[PDB]
Ligand binder design. Structure first.
Ligand SMILES: *C[C@@H](COC(=O)CCCCCCCCCCCCCCC)OC(=O)CCCCCCCCCCCCCCC
Ligand SMILES: Nc1ncnc2c1ncn2[C@@H]1O[C@H](COP(=O)(O)OP(=O)(O)O)[C@@H](O)[C@H]1O
Ligand SMILES: Nc1ncnc2c1ncn2[C@@H]1O[C@H](COP(=O)(O)OP(=O)(O)O)[C@@H](O)[C@H]1O
Ligand SMILES: *C(=O)CCCCCCCCCCCCCCC
Ligand SMILES: [Mg+2]
Ligand SMILES: [Mg+2]
Lengths: 222, 409, 10, 392, 223
């Protein structure tokens, strides 16, 4: 089993009260999971991914990852695991407009201290697998609404991570290109074996996987 | 009343976020450093001009005429030709000397002048800076002499002891003899600033003729002018009334460099403070272009209601002046406290760092005065506002070109 | 100040 | 491309707008330091020109330091010329300096006595008005007065004066009498300065003070403006250090105090320019909330994200000091080359400009250090925030 | 009677070294006092054709008119004067000024027009009470409810009595109970005050409450 999680209680300092929001959440994450983790409004979709990645640390819990604890780790070693076996896909326009589409996917290669002989070959082969070879040296400030989302998906699949943490892929576009990015995400587990999870606010756009798990405020309502 | 571009923009300045609460403190004290220091820096030069006409210009005679190495024989009928001149107030004779003081082997060279004690109150104020209770002890027949403060610091003497001076040799023809000396008692000391206190001494005219074995004869005629700046045109025509040519001098060759140096700092500190507010006006530009793209969803709302290009361009000009007027007035209300109470401020730093500055050896005066005026306060408010107008006009033209069709409206 | 010439005129 | 990850994240940040006005706001922190340095090197070059002109006219005409003994005079047989090995001394010459008084047939003036050697090179050689150097013979009692000293005394070429020494006097049981002799003048000299009114030339051999020996040794320094560093060195025995601060200790010290007031008045331009970096970089973190937190998700440690804005605060201080020193040296050198730019003064007497190369490095390193101390507070706020709360 | 011609407004957008046409062959009849219910979809022309008739956008080829005065062929100073009296703009993006209260946002079109100061206050007090406001009139829009943020935007673009109220789907960013109440408040404005409006929605459910609908597909009118 790749990732293990059981009884993760996240205690946040509210307005002079202490209310637990994540009450007894548990899921088994193996190598190559066909995951369809669905949620609702106020169920823990935007949360509990920072604890797995290492952005937030739980005060009353520990995230264990095949023998290596994520929560019991310093800040210097937390960023090491985010560049090799962890991917992040967001939808709040998290692209750098000062750079181009080639330098956005090469930015995790620069923090990982990769040599420039294989930086340009690993980055350009990811734009060819997505289908954005035309707007390779183009800034994201002039791209369309459907083309800017595909750069954020190609940003995390450069270093071939084990667990790809996604959050609302079809959130800022219509249903015309919804099947395009769902098919494009389906070419990742069959080529490098990258396990990922899909987050969707309703329960209609997540019918591509099998494990339809629902965790409302930590309680498993599958 | 209130305008549409002034009274409706006080609520726009109430903006909060992350570390934006400390930028309003930096932008206030950043523009107050070129206003509060300019208030004290310009009022201190006005204090130097106040002490110039009181401690320097009111004790030295401006116009002085002397013969060509001859005693003034016809000096009785040469006084009416000076007094009936449109621009000459008073006149008094004087006999200058060059004698030293040997009262304990001290190096001090003073300039003894034969001024009249009864006529010294009509042209200037000689005894107005004497520590004694009175000055009417200058009669005829007591051989008294009054010296300054800098002479007494090297002589190590007090008031009421017989000091020894050196009388120059009053020989009729050119011959060398023994030096003449006499012991006289000092009738009090005097102090003005510390500069003119070590080379200033005077004697009565009735006691100066007995030291030179002469009768009624002087060696110089002083005068007094109404206006001081035109001291090079009323003393030229008043010299040919006695003979062909005499030794003509004025205060320009001796104390004329003080008026030039008091205007050079005003022509240096003024433009140096434009460069302080000029970089401080760039802090207004850094918070105005940021206030356009962050508030880009608000300018498109006003353009849909009927706001023209002349109204939107006038929004951010007076919006940047709200952070400029609060910072400029924050240097004005603290500049009055430093200027009016500068005398406990300068004396506080001199007793902490060690040796004091502004010494009374070669400088102008001892203290640092500050005559705060109200015309210089108005001259720095328009300067701080005209420099902020160009800093708020160039980001205002950028916000007026923001079309509502490009933004998501 | 520190800029002195000290020249006299006759 | 760019294997250093610290500099790649800021090459596209120094200038992001396409228009001409939007690019000028990003370079506002560079001009505020460039205008502050060029208004600091140029103004102090004029004040250094006034100190260099006052040095060559006062300190260049008087003995700077005299190595005299502590028990009175100095025997030349005990301390010859080839014995002293002091640092900064390039020429050793004997001299006799004493505070004496003058006496003439018209007035009684003041003036020091300088015993020079006519067989050596004298700095007042072109200032003598048709007077040779070797006319100071021992026994004849010749004296070369000054031009401004002879004006108040009325002594032309060929008269007689009297030199009296009040300080160096012998003991006499009836009281205290000074030692005075007779001296005949041979001519005057003029150098258009202020030291000509209280200085006179005389032979080195004179029996008007004591005994024949000398008092000390006149030495020339490479820099006469500083003597406090050359006073605690290895001093020879039987002698004390007597610099020029005993007489002119308040004149040249007054010029150094005025440079510290003008240098502090013009230091307020770079003080607000250091405050502009806090405005230019502190507002950049509040708008780039989607770029700081997205780097931590890629694998950037918070120790390296602090040094991203440090170069952004150093890009205005490094280039602003080199461009400020280049433009400051151009205005001071080309001030009166073809036309006076700032105006014409009322005299027009060849206003000198002295540019010291060591003073530029001290000025430029201050602006390179004041631009980095104000950068630590916006750089710490970009790393102290959590990378979870910045994105929702 | 006719209020707007609506000829071939060919909007040729100039891309980066390219030229794209999005609105081609659009034609409807806006009448004086006639309500309309033009329905669109994801891809059809909405929220930019209203910028063409409103005057915010400038078309490349074509010129639409409004009672003789052309909207495209007009000066920049005269374009904002026509949006102050005879035009209205209602959106679901909550286009209000958060620095003021709810009373000043309704009085904000009356302040740019420079009317009498006794007229800016009495008119804003009557337009709020007709839609359900004036119980929280002196309140900021940040503390208002979800349904109260849209009802104040109806009275903002209705104080100068516009002859053409260009609305764009005011429902959606609020609850469903007050979603049908603001559609009825627009209908009372066309019968009492006589303000002709048009509501542009993406579905045919909201278009059935209004007048006859026009189906548009990439500029071309299908119905
Ligand atoms: C009387 C003066 C004379 O000074 C001089 O030596 C002559 C200076 C002549 C300078 C000519 C410069 C010409 C070139 C200008 C080039 C400008 C370029 C601009 C950019 C393009 O003696 C003095 O200097 C004394 C002056 C004292 C002034 C007062 C200083 C007060 C300082 C107060 C500091 C307060 C700090 C408070 C911090 C909280
Ligand atoms: N740092 C925080 N500050 C304020 N509220 C928080 C924070 N973290 C969690 N919450 C609250 O906990 C709830 C968790 O819901 P969330 O998982 O964010 O829903 P969704 O995933 O649909 O956005 C939210 O409603 C939010 O109000
Ligand atoms: N003239 C233009 N300028 C810029 N973008 C345009 C233009 N015309 C069309 N577009 C783009 O094409 C897309 C068409 O969407 P649109 O039909 O306007 O959606 P909606 O009808 O919901 O407003 C928009 O996202 C817009 O960015
Ligand atoms: C040379 O001109 C000698 C006369 C000097 C007159 C005084 C001008 C220099 C002293 C200025 C004192 C500092 C003022 C600081 C104000 C803030
Ligand atoms: Mg969310
Ligand atoms: Mg739309």
């Amino acid at each position: 089993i790749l990732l293990q999680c059981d009884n993760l209680c996240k205690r946040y300092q509210e307005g002079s009260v202490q209310t637990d929001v994540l009450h007894n959440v548990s899921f088994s994450v193996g190598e190559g999971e066909m995951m369809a983790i669905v949620g609702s409004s106020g169920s823990g979709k935007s949360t509990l991914l920072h604890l797995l990645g290492g952005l937030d640390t739980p005060t009353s819990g520990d995230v264990i990852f095949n023998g290596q604890p994520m929560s019991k780790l310093s800040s210097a070693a937390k960023a090491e695991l985010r560049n090799q076996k962890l991917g992040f896909i967001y939808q709040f326009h998290h692209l750098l407009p000062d750079f181009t589409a080639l330098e956005n996917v090469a930015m995790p290669l620069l923090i990982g201290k990769k040599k420039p002989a294989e930086i340009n070959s690993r980055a350009l082969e990811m734009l060819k697998a997505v289908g954005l070879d035309h707007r390779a040296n183009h800034r994201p400030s002039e791209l369309s609404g459907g083309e800017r989302q595909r750069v954020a998906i190609a940003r995390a699949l450069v270093n071939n991570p084990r667990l790809v943490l996604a959050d609302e892929p079809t959130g800022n576009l219509d249903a015309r290109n919804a099947d395009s990015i769902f098919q494009l995400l389906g070419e990742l587990n069959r080529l490098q074996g990258t396990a990922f999870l899909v987050v969707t606010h309703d329960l209609q756009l997540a019918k591509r996987m099998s494990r339809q798990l629902e965790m409302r405020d930590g309680r498993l309502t599958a | 009343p209130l305008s549409l571009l002034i009274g409706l923009r006080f609520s726009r300045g109430r903006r909060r976020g992350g570390m934006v609460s400390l930028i309003s403190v930096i932008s206030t004290i950043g523009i107050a450093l070129g206003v509060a220091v300019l208030i004290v820096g310009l009022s201190a030069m006005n204090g130097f001009e106040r002490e110039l006409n009181n401690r320097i210009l009111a004790v030295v005679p401006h116009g002085e005429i002397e013969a060509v190495d001859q005693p003034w024989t016809n000096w009785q009928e040469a006084l009416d030709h000076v007094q009936k001149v449109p621009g000459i107030a008073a006149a008094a004779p004087y006999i200058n000397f060059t004698g030293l003081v040997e009262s304990g082997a001290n190096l001090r060279a003073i300039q003894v002048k034969g001024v009249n004690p009864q006529q010294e109150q009509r042209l200037s104020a000689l005894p107005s800076f004497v520590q004694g209770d009175a000055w009417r002890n200058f009669k005829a027949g007591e051989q008294q002499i009054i010296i300054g403060k800098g002479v007494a610091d090297a002589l190590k003497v007090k008031q009421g002891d017989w000091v020894s001076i050196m009388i120059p040799n009053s020989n009729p023809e050119h011959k060398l003899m023994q030096p003449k000396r006499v012991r006289l008692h000092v009738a009090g000391i005097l102090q003005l600033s510390g500069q003119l206190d070590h080379s200033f001494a005077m004697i009565p005219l009735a006691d100066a003729q007995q030291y030179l074995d002469m009768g009624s004869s002087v060696s110089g005629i002083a005068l007094k002018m109404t206006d001081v700046f035109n001291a090079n045109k009323l003393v030229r025509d008043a010299g040919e009334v006695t003979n062909s040519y005499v030794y003509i001098k004025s205060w320009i060759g001796t104390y004329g460099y003080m008026y030039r140096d008091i205007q050079m700092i005003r022509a240096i500190m003024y433009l140096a403070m434009v460069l302080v507010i000029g970089v401080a006006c760039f802090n207004i530009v850094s918070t105005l272009v940021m206030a356009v793209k962050d508030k880009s969803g608000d300018i498109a709302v006003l353009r849909t209601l009927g706001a023209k290009d002349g109204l939107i361009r006038a929004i951010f000009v007076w919006y940047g002046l709200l952070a400029g007027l609060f910072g400029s007035l924050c240097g004005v209300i603290i500049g009055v406290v430093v200027s009016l109470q500068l005398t406990p401020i300068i004396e506080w730093i001199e007793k902490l760092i060690g040796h004091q500055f502004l010494s009374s050896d070669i400088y102008f005066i001892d203290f640092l005065p500050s005559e705060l005026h109200w015309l210089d306060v108005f001259y720095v408010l328009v300067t701080a506002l005209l420099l902020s107008l160009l800093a708020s006009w160039y980001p205002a033209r950028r916000a007026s070109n923001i079309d509502p069709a490009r933004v998501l409206s | 100040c520190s800029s002195n010439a000290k020249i006299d005129q006759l | 491309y760019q294997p250093v990850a610290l500099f790649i994240g800021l090459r596209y940040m120094r200038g992001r707008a396409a228009d001409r006005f939007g690019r000028f706001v990003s370079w506002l922190s560079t001009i505020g330091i460039t205008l502050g340095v060029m208004a600091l090197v140029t103004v102090l070059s004029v004040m250094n020109g006034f100190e260099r002109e006052l040095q060559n006219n006062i300190l260049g005409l008087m003995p700077q330091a005299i190595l005299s003994s502590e028990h009175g005079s100095l025997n030349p047989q005990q301390l010859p010329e080839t014995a002293v090995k002091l640092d900064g001394v390039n020429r050793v010459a004997p001299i006799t300096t004493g505070d004496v008084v003058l006496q003439s047939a018209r007035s009684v003036a003041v003036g020091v006595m300088l015993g020079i050697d006519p067989a050596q090179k004298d700095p007042l050689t072109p200032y003598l008005v048709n007077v040779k150097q070797t006319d100071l013979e021992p026994g004849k009692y010749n004296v070369i007065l000054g031009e401004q000293l002879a004006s108040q005394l009325g002594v032309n070429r060929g008269d007689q004066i009297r030199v009296m020494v009040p300080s160096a006097s012998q003991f006499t049981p009836m009281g205290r009498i000074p030692s005075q002799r007779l001296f005949n003048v041979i001519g005057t000299f003029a150098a258009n300065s202020e030291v000509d009114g209280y200085e006179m030339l005389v032979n080195i051999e004179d029996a008007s003070r004591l005994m024949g020996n000398i008092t000390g040794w006149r030495l020339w320094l490479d820099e006469p403006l500083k003597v406090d560093s050359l006073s605690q060195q290895k001093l020879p025995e039987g002698s004390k250090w007597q610099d020029w601060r005993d007489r002119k200790g308040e004149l040249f010290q007054a010029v150094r105090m005025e440079k510290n007031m003008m240098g502090l008045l013009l230091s307020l331009i770079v003080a607000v320019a250091a405050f502009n970096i806090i405005t230019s970089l502190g507002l950049m973190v509040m708008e780039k909330q989607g770029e700081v937190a997205i780097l931590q998700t890629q694998g950037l440690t918070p120790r390296q994200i602090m040094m991203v804005f440090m170069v952004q605060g150093a890009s205005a201080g490094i280039i602003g000091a080199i461009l400020g020193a280049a433009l400051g040296a151009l205005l001071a050198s080309q001030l009166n080359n073809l036309m006076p730019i700032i105006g014409v003064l009322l005299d027009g007497a060849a206003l000198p400009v002295a540019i010291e190369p060591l003073q530029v490095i001290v000025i430029a390193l201050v602006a390179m250090a004041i631009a980095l101390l104000s950068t630590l507070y916006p750089s710490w706020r970009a790393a102290a925030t959590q990378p979870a709360e910045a994105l929702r």
